[PDB]
Design a protein around this ligand. Structure first.
Ligand code: MG
Ligand code: MG
Lengths: 497, 497
């Protein structure tokens, strides 16, 4: 049926091994974050490392590569078998772009740069990270040259994290935002409409109280606990896929500002449903699973902001908040609403409300394009970052930790990664209007906890397709169009005005 | 220092990969038992399977085998580097004894036999397992021939599960037991000394109550929770080693008969301390880790029976039992003692007290030797099992589930495995008297929770040695002698008389 071609089957049989190491890697990483006794880190680390080298070795074995090339030379193949090749061709390609020595240099430099960035952020000292940043800039440029690119070197890094993404693409969405979203922000901020803070941010809670609320929400979403999924705690919320029938998410309980653990759980749920609603006929194959960081963030943001910050979701959970939170006997559902939608330009990207968030990404985008294009100087980045923070949000970081040092991405060498976050926010808006068309009673269903039709709409349009088509081709096929920042602007307008 | 030879280093570098897959396998199995959502089993299973084949492939790669052969031809090597070779030579040997087709036959037959045994036990019907048992008997004999053996074919299966174990060895220990331990049992059973049951067996408890008791005991033992170890729940208690700095055990809470979860946790702790007290200079190498099933069970039984059922351990935990168990306000510490040491011949091996336990193993030993030696008939095993149960314990199973069908071992193809359990019980007694010599205030230290000297004695004598020496050579070096059933008999005599 789905996999008929003989060359394709030989490939899938070998791929199983590669797939198994990956299954193992996920379990290792998840366990490292959720269960592992602290001192087990050295042995976990070497195990993770040996497998990554083993995995890479198997992907580039002559036999495997020969098969992919051969199949790539077949015209008989259906879309599914074709998806196998497109995906595997991109992997083998990316994997052999870097000389084994270069992969080594990066691992070394990266590891040491992360540690240096880690103390530098804590002690607010850019000098301790600066030289490491210059080394990472050089590695990024080299990487762009190893990967190859038509227009700009930055296209190669972007394409690394979002298949088919180009600098021109990113340049465009941010233009529409800077001229249409920026003013909307100013207007919102000056009418005193929504507040910049809320007393509910200070209300403390005991872990068990919120875990009762999160649990209730996940069951309302139909999250298949104990059967195909789990919810646990870890330093930072994430989602992992051990398989189509085994997807896990985590959240954290800060102990105060209950909005965090709630929306964070919902956010991760969005990622999970996606992996959960994959097509089982693709099990063990490279086409199963979310196609990219951007499409994945369109799902997490869809559930988090489109639904989670909506008045209806608030009414639905309101009674549960009252049952488990004592301090809730002093607030109304509107109080919870305003709380969930506060708007306030601030220093930290991970705390940015939905209206100011994308400006944190635009600046990282500008600095990144410059770093890999022109001959930018690390020692000069802090001020450029500061001037940009001031030009977009009116505030200026006073210390390195509130600014250029806040995120781990650069130290990890993840240059050309940040833009995928904006894509997700944008795409979540666009998807909302397309579903709002097939399900005009969208809001009413949320308020009543009737999510099946919404979950099914997402499946047919996005999920079941896995990695069959590249990100762009996937959107056209399912939404009749390409990403368009315009939707995010209307969503915001229609929500704050 | 420890690893100097160049050929030895080349081996250890390649071994790391093999070691990493194993680290991964442990995490997979542990997670399967403790966290995995039920439906994640199919994907977990295929992942476990692909890795086992990958692992076997790496162990038998020409390069790896050539290196081991080469090093085996070096006379310059210290004991440690030598241990590496002995261990790896035995693995490569065992691994290539079975034709890939045979390994296949066994996997197939085994899988189907386990499923058939599983329903057969539940529906008390031996006919549903019978043919599968004949197939497994044939596989066992073939296996003995593939492995090779001097005296009996059963020596090959025994050596498979306990390096260097011979049929003559097993024949001997059981002779000393049948003439010296058997009568002791009869005498114990006829004087009404210790009871055959206790009311505490019926006392129910809520999970949290006993988890507070188990937690307290593990901290009293110095079990390094959150740092190098974990305690969780699973269908059946076990111990896993992800590494020297990451060892995990599980227990279960039946909800009644609190002795079970307690001694079970202690039992597993014994296994863990062993892996925990390994020599870190051997990290990532084949000499790190417990040498065999028998030595491992000498540790688990040491803590479980030697210490856990002793009057002192009872006095130490008594107050904790009173604090957390309401129904304890009706019993005294002697009541807990008699409870922990009940003696009663019964049908189920896993429930057998320490005096009757080894007779369950002797019969399995007799049936196993016959099955692989003479032309034994599956259809005739049930009666032989029944007559033996009657000849040793005076009771006769009335249904297949109380008899020949109670254990999974044969269906898994684990023939020649059972005797390692008796070895552990026996060895736990012998070790007790040897430590009783260097630490005559053994009892006093237990009652006061001073386990460090006892933990350290075990380290120097057994643990730190890992897999440097074969089981037998390990005992001579550390205890100045070989296993001798006689100690277990005195221990029992001195305890029940
Ligand atoms: Mg996300
Ligand atoms: Mg054990």
């Amino acid at each position: 049926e789905v996999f008929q071609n003989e060359t394709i089957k030989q490939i899938l049989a070998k791929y199983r091994r590669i797939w198994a190491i990956g299954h193992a890697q996920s379990v290792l990483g998840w366990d490292l974050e959720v269960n592992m006794p602290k001192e087990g880190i050295l042995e976990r680390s070497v195990a993770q490392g040996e497998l990554s080298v083993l995995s890479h070795e198997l992907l580039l074995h002559p036999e495997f590569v020969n098969l992919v090339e051969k199949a790539k030379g077949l015209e008989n193949l259906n879309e599914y078998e074709r998806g196998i090749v497109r995906v595997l061709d991109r992997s083998i390609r990316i994997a052999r772009a870097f000389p084994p020595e270069f992969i080594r240099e990066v691992s070394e430099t990266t590891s040491l740069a992360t540690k240096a960035w880690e103390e530098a952020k804590a002690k607010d000292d850019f000098s301790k990270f600066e030289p490491w940043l210059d080394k990472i800039i050089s590695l990024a440029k080299r990487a762009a040259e190893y990967l190859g690119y038509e227009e700009e070197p930055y296209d190669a890094l972007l394409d690394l994290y979002e298949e088919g993404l180009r600098t021109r693409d990113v340049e465009k969405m941010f233009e529409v935002l800077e001229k249409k979203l920026k003013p909307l922000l100013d207007k919102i901020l000056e009418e005193g409409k929504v507040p910049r803070e809320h007393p509910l941010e200070k209300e403390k809670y005991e872990r068990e109280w919120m875990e009762r609320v999160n649990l209730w929400i996940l069951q309302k979403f139909g999250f298949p606990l104990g059967t195909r999924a789990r919810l646990d705690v870890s330093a930072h919320p994430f989602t992992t896929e051990f398989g189509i029938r085994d997807v896990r998410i985590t959240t954290r309980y800060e102990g105060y500002d209950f909005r965090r653990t709630i929306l964070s759980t919902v956010h991760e749920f969005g990622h999970a449903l996606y992996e959960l609603q994959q097509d089982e006929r693709f099990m063990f194959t490279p086409i199963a699973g979310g196609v990219s960081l951007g499409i994945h963030e369109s799902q997490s943001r869809f559930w988090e902001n489109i639904i989670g910050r909506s008045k209806e979701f608030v009414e639905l959970i309101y009674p549960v908040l009252k049952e488990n939170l004592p301090f809730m006997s002093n607030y109304t559902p509107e109080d919870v609403y305003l709380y969930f939608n506060i708007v306030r330009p601030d220093f930290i990207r991970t705390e940015a409300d939905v209206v100011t968030y994308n400006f944190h990404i635009l600046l990282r985008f500008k600095l990144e394009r410059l770093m890999v294009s022109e001959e930018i100087k690390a020692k000069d980045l802090p001020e450029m970052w500061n001037d940009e923070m001031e030009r977009l949000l009116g505030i200026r970081p006073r210390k390195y930790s509130e600014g250029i040092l806040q995120d781990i991405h650069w130290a990890h060498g993840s240059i050309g990664y940040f833009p995928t976050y904006t894509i997700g926010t944008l795409l979540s808006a666009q998807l909302y209007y397309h579903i709002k068309k097939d399900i005009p009673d969208f809001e009413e269903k949320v308020a009543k906890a009737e999510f099946d039709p919404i979950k099914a709409w997402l499946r047919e349009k996005i999920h079941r397709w896995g990695s069959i088509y590249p990100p762009k081709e996937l959107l056209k096929k399912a939404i009749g169009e390409d990403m368009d920042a315009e939707y995010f602007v209307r969503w915001v307008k229609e929500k704050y005005l």
